[PDB]
Amino acid sequence: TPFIRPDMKAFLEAIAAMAGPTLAEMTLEEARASYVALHGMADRPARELAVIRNLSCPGPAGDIPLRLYDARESREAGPVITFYHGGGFVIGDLDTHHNLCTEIAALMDLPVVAVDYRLAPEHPFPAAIEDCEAATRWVASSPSELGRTASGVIPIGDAAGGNATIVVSQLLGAKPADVPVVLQVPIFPLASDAVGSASLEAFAEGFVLTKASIEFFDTAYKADRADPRGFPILGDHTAAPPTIVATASLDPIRDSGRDYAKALVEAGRDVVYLEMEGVTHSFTNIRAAVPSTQGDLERIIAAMKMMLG
Amino acid sequence: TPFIRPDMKAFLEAIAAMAGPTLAEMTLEEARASYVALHGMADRPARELAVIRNLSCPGPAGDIPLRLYDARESREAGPVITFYHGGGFVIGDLDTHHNLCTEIAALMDLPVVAVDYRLAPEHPFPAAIEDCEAATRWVASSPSELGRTASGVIPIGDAAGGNATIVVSQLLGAKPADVPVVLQVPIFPLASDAVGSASLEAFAEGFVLTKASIEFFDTAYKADRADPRGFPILGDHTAAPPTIVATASLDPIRDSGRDYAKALVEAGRDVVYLEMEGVTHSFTNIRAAVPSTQGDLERIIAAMKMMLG
Amino acid sequence: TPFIRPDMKAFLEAIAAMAGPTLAEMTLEEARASYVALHGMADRPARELAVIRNLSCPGPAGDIPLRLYDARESREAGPVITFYHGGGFVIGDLDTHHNLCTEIAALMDLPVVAVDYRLAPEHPFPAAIEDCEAATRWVASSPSELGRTASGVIPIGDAAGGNATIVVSQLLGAKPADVPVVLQVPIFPLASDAVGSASLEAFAEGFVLTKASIEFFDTAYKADRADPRGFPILGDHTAAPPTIVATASLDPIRDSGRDYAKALVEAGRDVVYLEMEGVTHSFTNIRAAVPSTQGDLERIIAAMKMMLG
Amino acid sequence: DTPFIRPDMKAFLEAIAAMAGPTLAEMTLEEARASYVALHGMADRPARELAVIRNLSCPGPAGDIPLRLYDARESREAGPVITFYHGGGFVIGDLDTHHNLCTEIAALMDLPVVAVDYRLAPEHPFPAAIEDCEAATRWVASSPSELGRTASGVIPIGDAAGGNATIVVSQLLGAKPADVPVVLQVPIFPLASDAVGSASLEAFAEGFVLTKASIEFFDTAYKADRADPRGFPILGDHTAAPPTIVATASLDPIRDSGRDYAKALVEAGRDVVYLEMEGVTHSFTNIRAAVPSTQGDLERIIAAMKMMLG
Ligand SMILES: O=[N+]([O-])c1ccc(O)cc1
Ligand SMILES: O=[N+]([O-])c1ccc(O)cc1
Ligand SMILES: O=[N+]([O-])c1ccc(O)cc1
Ligand SMILES: O=[N+]([O-])c1ccc(O)cc1
Ligand SMILES: O=[N+]([O-])c1ccc(O)cc1
Ligand SMILES: O=[N+]([O-])c1ccc(O)cc1
Ligand SMILES: O=[N+]([O-])c1ccc(O)cc1
Ligand SMILES: O=[N+]([O-])c1ccc(O)cc1
Ligand SMILES: O=[N+]([O-])c1ccc(O)cc1
Ligand SMILES: O=[N+]([O-])c1ccc(O)cc1
Ligand SMILES: O=[N+]([O-])c1ccc(O)cc1
Ligand SMILES: CCCCCC(=O)O
Ligand SMILES: CCCCCC(=O)O
Ligand SMILES: CCCCCC(=O)O
Ligand SMILES: CCCCCC(=O)O
Ligand SMILES: CCCCCC(=O)O
């Protein structure tokens, strides 16, 4: 029996008791709606912020919707956080990760820009990546419409968003935006293919994210397993920016995040590796249902502050 | 053509111009004196503190000399830093690392207890470990002579002291002292055998610590390559305490520290890996000759404060 | 405050940062190794020469080790330099003054024979003098092992070696060797007792040679203050050979050197008195750490060439 | 005693003794001055041939001071300039008595030499000579157009009274700098400390060229107060003395005065070369034909000057 916190185990028991249907079983509208409902019920409420503003920027296939969060209406030049939500590149949007974005903006006292990237299966790989990249470049250019000047960007994201974080840092590393990536924060990222990993076999069912969902997401997104924009473990780590990798000890894709932090050490890159003990995948968005997960996010915040100086 | 900082390059040029003998070509006391002079002449002066006191604790061979450093005349229960110097378990002493110890005490605002462990070749392996373990367990016991109640210990050390840091944390992990290891800070540690590593071949000559010096230390200390008290990469990493591993990009034993941080990630343990760019082995003790290394030490201190809360 | 050169001040600041134990707090082997390490790091490297050879000569206690230095593989009859190292008659050896000897041989284009005389406290006064005298008389005899005929001898030495320089020149003046002393070069010598001098009070601490070291050397050597072989100011100056006296403006024993040159003028003898401005005792052996001291040694060399005609 | 005397030196002294000529007191000033001109004219080596031997003059405190420039070179780089003050007790000597010595110093140093025709006692008593030596040295140190070469520094030099003037000038320029520093001073058998009461004056009072009788005669004419450091520069502040070469003679009645000065410089931590020429007298610099070994003594002073400058 792997270690599980009591608060985390009750939540898994409640999900099992509630016994909802799989992503395969639901329409795309219902599956998307169930993800909204899960974070709506499970996450702490949104922080009150001076700024919660819809924006958009030009993208390779039309405008990309954005949402700006800032505890301040007016601020000095500084790093800007560019956030990419999880959901296998199929589900989630600006609302599923809204409260988490308000928490990051409140606790860091930095602006956060969340990206409403194109979703599969309607828009398969590499749509999401291209929009995450374009939106990050746009923020990094300190456009008038952002309302604050960016000295640097901080890519951050959960799960598929952690994948996007790593891919965007690699793309801006090869072709710089107007300011550097000063820190990346991949949270339970997919970096290496989870297929064949010990974590995926150990946590395949009953740990919030399932092997069933992972196969559902894989079929929708259609990323080539040889493409570094799909599986960024395959990219060049020799100039990776300062990194914080956070994983969960019960995550089926835990070993994917281990793999990435090991590759950064192997390449001589600075990295904070935090493996949250006795919690699952999604821990950043279940901070009311599993209250100890607020402490986990706060450890990531403390690491981010240290790594920015 | 590896990256070298200008101040670091000037220092390596001065050493090369000196063209001194190898440690093995010197008498044993001339080898010890050469390291006293290197650190004495290259390091920043001691910080002024309220408390710098010589004391001793029982060990398996007899008394183990200790030095207490504290910026405060008196303090309540808190973590106590237990420091083990470098020098291949052959050279160094309480004076070679005294200034660095005052700086750790000043910047952390925690008490530091430095250990004058027994040296090889007079006291081969595992004498240094026995003494570092006994002194750390003694500090952890909150003895009245120290006047500083320990809620926790923080093993820290450079090079051989980084080796001792990891071994001590393993031994206390397996048979606890009166309080836990709350953080360990191996700085350019020997964890895996450096023989056959790419870093040892790249940086064998001209980077402060040499392959000749490593061979000299190995002949004197006589650690069995199969004994986890000699090569702690062989130890059980599954319950390792929170860790900061700091390396130098030009260190012949750099890959040993990369190996250890990678082993902690592989085991799901929390770790900060910092690889200082364009500096050598010994960067903690050359902070006057190579002024940019002060900022390197300050990064370790910032990581320590984050990982303690 | 007294005038100090910026390069000299930077070296005194490094010694103050080091804050070593005193010579008396160390073992004899440690005290000796500390001097090796000081000159090893502080002096310019050895010049390359055609001849650097170890030999020995008979003395009153047994064989005296010698080292011959010569820029030329073969040379005709000429003066030979007979060098005696400093170190209070307690520390120093053929290696501590080696580089300086290679420099004197390179810049003078004359052969140099350094004397490894017996040291206190194991061999108290007048052991050092007996050996320096026997070696100088031996060199003056043009022995076939030397491979170079002496037309004359040039005693030279620093500190205790400058004491020995003067004593040896007095002993050979009273009972000639096979060839005369044609020039003597006492460098920061002890001629008159430093105890009670104004320079000893002014420069007792922080100017390389300390009053504590002087007292340490006095206790080991045990020269009687009435014996002219310990305090050669007490000797007969009426037939002193041509002399160069070099002192340092910051030397605790500076006034001893002033006293000797004054005694030579009083007796009508030819003397060059050079007092190096803004440097300490040991300036001859710190020519890498304090680069301006190379020019001080070159002034002594120019005076030597002028006085040899 | 029987002090050591070189055979050539002793031959010169015995020839002077055989002449049994009058004292400075038994002669008129004009006779004393012409007698010294004749002595040096026979006893010194001849003038070296130089590119430049030129009369110049500079303003002084009591009117124009006559000077003579000696240079081996018509045109030279900026460098030190030697400022020379002749001996003769501040009563006798002139530009001509020390002319050949000047040409020799210019030829062997390959530096320009400016000799000062300072005002003589008893017509111009102390401090006239000193005020003229100081004015001329300051004028040379200003690198005036009329000098024809740039001074980077000055080198006071002089024999006997002129060694006295050398030290006093160095002290005056030390307290109130000229446009360039004194880079070296070369007092040759100087009067620094009062010779009265010295062991050398008693030993060498008669028969060694300079006599106690002549010393009394000069003292009477010059009238310097024994407490005035411009008269007796042993009394001045040595703490910032420039690099010095003190040359004395072993048979000089004022030898001990020169010893006293070189000792005071060592006592003050100043760089000094002390050369005491063995078996020769006072005025060895100007008897170099009568006593050929004295050429070697001058050449040692030259070698010391090159070492102390270079
Ligand atoms: O993608 N995800 O992280 C998921 C997917 C399904 C679910 O029920 C919870 C989380
Ligand atoms: O959503 N996710 O975290 C995923 C989705 C697909 C996959 O292959 C691995 C992880
Ligand atoms: O969620 N994700 O990060 C994914 C999903 C599918 C895939 O092929 C690669 C990555
Ligand atoms: O052990 N060390 O770190 C060393 C050893 C030798 C040396 O010259 C410098 C540093
Ligand atoms: O310095 N060290 O850490 C060492 C030295 C020798 C050895 O065999 C193992 C480790
Ligand atoms: O001093 N050191 O860090 C060492 C000593 C020995 C060795 O095998 C490796 C490293
Ligand atoms: O004798 N000496 O020159 C010394 C002795 C000791 C020391 O630390 C420095 C110089
Ligand atoms: O080593 N030294 O230069 C010394 C040693 C002893 C003493 O009394 C004076 C000077
Ligand atoms: O170093 N020295 O020259 C010395 C040392 C001791 C002493 O009594 C006299 C002279
Ligand atoms: O001419 N001289 O050299 C003299 C003249 C007078 C005197 O008191 C001493 C020396
Ligand atoms: O010739 N001199 O140098 C003299 C002459 C007289 C005197 O009072 C002082 C010095
Ligand atoms: C097999 C995977 C379960 C967790 C074991 C580990 O921490 O590597
Ligand atoms: C060959 C080892 C030197 C540096 C290459 C690296 O960072 O892995
Ligand atoms: C008190 C001793 C220090 C130096 C003063 C001098 O040069 O005589
Ligand atoms: C200048 C004419 C000579 C006068 C000399 C004298 O008064 O003795
Ligand atoms: C005053 C007697 C002359 C010679 C003695 C000496 O050289 O001091």
| Experiment type | X-ray
**How do D79-85 and D113-116 pair as beta strands?**
parallel
CB atoms < 10 A from the CB of C28, how many?
16
> In degrees to the nearest 10, what's the CA dihedral of B31, B33, B35, B40?
-170
- DSSP code of B212? H
Q: Atom 2, ligand 2: which residue's CA is nearest?
A: A88
Q: What ranges in chain C are assigned the alpha helix state H?
A: 6-18, 28-42, 98-108, 127-140, 160-174, 198-202, 211-221, 254-266, 293-308
| Token duo for residue A301 | 């915040």
Residue (of A58, A54, A210, A181) closest to A131 by Cα position:
A58
Q: Is D193 helix (H, G, I), strand (E, B) or coil?
A: coil
Q: In chain B, positions 215-254, which contact chain A (CB-CB < 8 Å)?
A: 247, 249, 254
Partners of C183 in beta bridges: none
In angstroms, what is the C-alpha Rg of chain D? 18
Residue (of D261, D252, D262) closest to D284 by Cα position:
D252
| Token duo for residue B114 | 């430095």
The nearest CA of chain C is from the CA of D162 a distance in Å of 21
CA distance C262 to C257: 9
CB atoms < 10 A from the CB of D197, how many?
9
Cα–Cα distances (Å) from D286 to D164, D185, D192, D255, D305, in that order, read 17, 19, 21, 17, 18
Cα–Cα distances (Å) from C242 to B185, C166, C274, C306, in that order, read 64, 11, 14, 11
Pocket test for ligand 16, best of D1, D198, D200 (most atoms within 8 A of CB): D200
Pocket test for ligand 1, best of A213, A216, A251, A280 (most atoms within 8 A of CB): A213
CA distance C268 to C271: 9
Superfamily covering domain D1-310:
Alpha/Beta hydrolase fold, catalytic domain (3.40.50.1820)
Across the interface, do D307 and C309 touch by the CB < 8 Å criterion?
no
CA distance A177 to A79: 13
Helix (H) or strand (E) holding B104: helix B98-108
| Token duo for residue A47 | 């922080």
| Token duo for residue D259 | 């010893």
Asked if A216 and A88 touch (Cβ cutoff 8 Å), the reply is yes
CB atoms < 10 A from the CB of D253, how many?
27
Q: Residue with structure tokens 């052991």?
A: C127
Asked if D116 and D67 touch (Cβ cutoff 8 Å), the reply is yes
**How do C150-158 and C78-84 pair as beta strands?**
parallel
> In degrees to the nearest 10, what's the CA dihedral of B80, B85, B88, B93?
-130
Asked if D246 and D275 touch (Cβ cutoff 8 Å), the reply is yes
Q: Is A126 helix (H, G, I), strand (E, B) or coil?
A: coil
CA distance B140 to B117: 17
> In degrees to the nearest 10, what's the CA dihedral of B88, B94, B100, B102?
160
CA distance A73 to A111: 10
Concatenate the DSSP letters of all residues of D206-266 into one string: SSSSS-HHHHHHHHHHH---TT-TTT-GGGS--TTPPPEEEEEETT-TTHHHHHHHHHHHH
List of chain D residues whose C-beta atoms are within 8 Å of the C-beta of residue C264: 274
**How do D113-116 and D65-71 pair as beta strands?**
antiparallel
Residue (of C46, C240, C260) closest to C162 by Cα position:
C260
Concatenate the DSSP letters of all residues of A267-287 into one string: TT--EEEEEETT--TTGGG-T
| Token duo for residue C141 | 């005899």
Q: Is B127 helix (H, G, I), strand (E, B) or coil?
A: helix
| Token duo for residue B134 | 């006994």
Residue (of A264, A272, A270) closest to A246 by Cα position:
A272
**How do D186-188 and A78-84 pair as beta strands?**
unpaired
A214 Cβ closer than 6 Å to some ligand 1 atom = no
| Token duo for residue A161 | 């968003």
CA distance C88 to C303: 26
Q: Domain spans of chain A? A: 1-309
Helix (H) or strand (E) holding D301: helix D293-309
The one-letter code for the residue type at B222 is K
Helix C127-140 vs helix C160-174: crossing angle, to nearest 10: 60
Q: Which residues contact C253 (CB under 8 A, 6 or more apart)?
A: C159, C188, C189, C190, C194, C197, C199, C200, C209, C214, C281
Q: Is D204 helix (H, G, I), strand (E, B) or coil?
A: coil
CA distance D217 to D255: 19
**How do A271-276 and B271-276 pair as beta strands?**
antiparallel
Cα–Cα distances (Å) from A74 to A115, A126, A149, D61, D87, in that order, read 22, 35, 10, 80, 90
Partners of B158 in beta bridges: B187
Asked if A131 and A65 touch (Cβ cutoff 8 Å), the reply is no
CB atoms < 10 A from the CB of C121, how many?
14
CA distance B296 to B286: 11
Asked if C303 and C24 touch (Cβ cutoff 8 Å), the reply is no
Tell me which of C11, C13, C36 to substitute to probe the interface with B (most B C-beta atoms closer than 10 Å).
C36
Comparing CB atoms, the residue among C27, C32, C41 nearest residue B37 is: C41
Q: Atom 9, ligand 9: which residue's CA is nearest?
A: C230
Residue (of B305, B182, B141, B163) closest to B245 by Cα position:
B163
> In degrees to the nearest 10, what's the CA dihedral of B84, B89, B91, B97?
-10
Partners of C245 in beta bridges: C273
Asked if B154 and B184 touch (Cβ cutoff 8 Å), the reply is yes
Q: Is the alpha carbon torsion for C217, C221, C224, C226 positive or negative? A: negative
CA distance B246 to B252: 14
Calculate ∠ Cα D96-D98-D102, nearest 5°.
Answer: 110
Asked if D246 and D253 touch (Cβ cutoff 8 Å), the reply is no
Q: Atom 7, ligand 8: which residue's CA is nearest?
A: C214
| Token duo for residue D197 | 């009461």
CA distance B213 to B206: 12
Helix (H) or strand (E) holding A186: strand A185-187
Q: What topology is assigned to A1-309 in CATH?
A: Rossmann fold (3.40.50)
Helix B28-42 vs helix C6-18: crossing angle, to nearest 10: 120
Q: What are phi and psi of C138, to 5 degrees?
A: -60, -50
Partners of D263 in beta bridges: none
Q: Atom 2, ligand 11: which residue's CA is nearest?
A: D161
In angstroms, what is the C-alpha Rg of chain B? 18
Q: Is D49 helix (H, G, I), strand (E, B) or coil?
A: coil
Cis peptide before D144 (omega within 30 of 0): no
CA distance B18 to D140: 48
CA distance C111 to C156: 12
Q: Is B213 helix (H, G, I), strand (E, B) or coil?
A: helix
**How do D65-71 and D52-58 pair as beta strands?**
antiparallel
Cα–Cα distances (Å) from C27 to A187, C30, C136, D148, in that order, read 58, 5, 31, 68
Resolution (A): 2.0
Question: Buried b vs exposed e over B259-295: b needs ≥16 C-beta within 10 Å?
Answer: bbbbbbbeebbbbbbbbbbbbbbbbbbbbbbbebbee
Partners of B247 in beta bridges: B275
Asked if C163 and C193 touch (Cβ cutoff 8 Å), the reply is no
**How do B51-58 and A271-276 pair as beta strands?**
unpaired
CA distance B195 to A148: 52
Q: How many CA atoms are closer than 13 Å to the CA of A127, on its beta-carbon side?
A: 19
CA distance C158 to C135: 17
- DSSP code of C209? S
CA distance B225 to C287: 44
Q: In chain C, positions 275-294, which contact chain D (CB-CB < 8 Å)?
A: 275
CA distance D197 to D218: 17
Residue (of D121, A161, C280, C206) closest to A169 by Cα position:
A161
Cis peptide before C79 (omega within 30 of 0): no
**How do A62-70 and A112-115 pair as beta strands?**
antiparallel
Q: What ranges in C43-111 are assigned the alpha helix state H?
A: 98-108
Across the interface, do B273 and A274 touch by the CB < 8 Å criterion?
no
Nearest CA in chain C to D303: C306
In angstroms, what is the C-alpha Rg of chain A? 18
Comparing CB atoms, the residue among C249, C261, C302 nearest residue D266 is: C261
Q: Which residues contact D301 (CB under 8 A, 6 or more apart)?
A: D186, D188, D245, D247, D275, D285
Q: Is A168 helix (H, G, I), strand (E, B) or coil?
A: helix
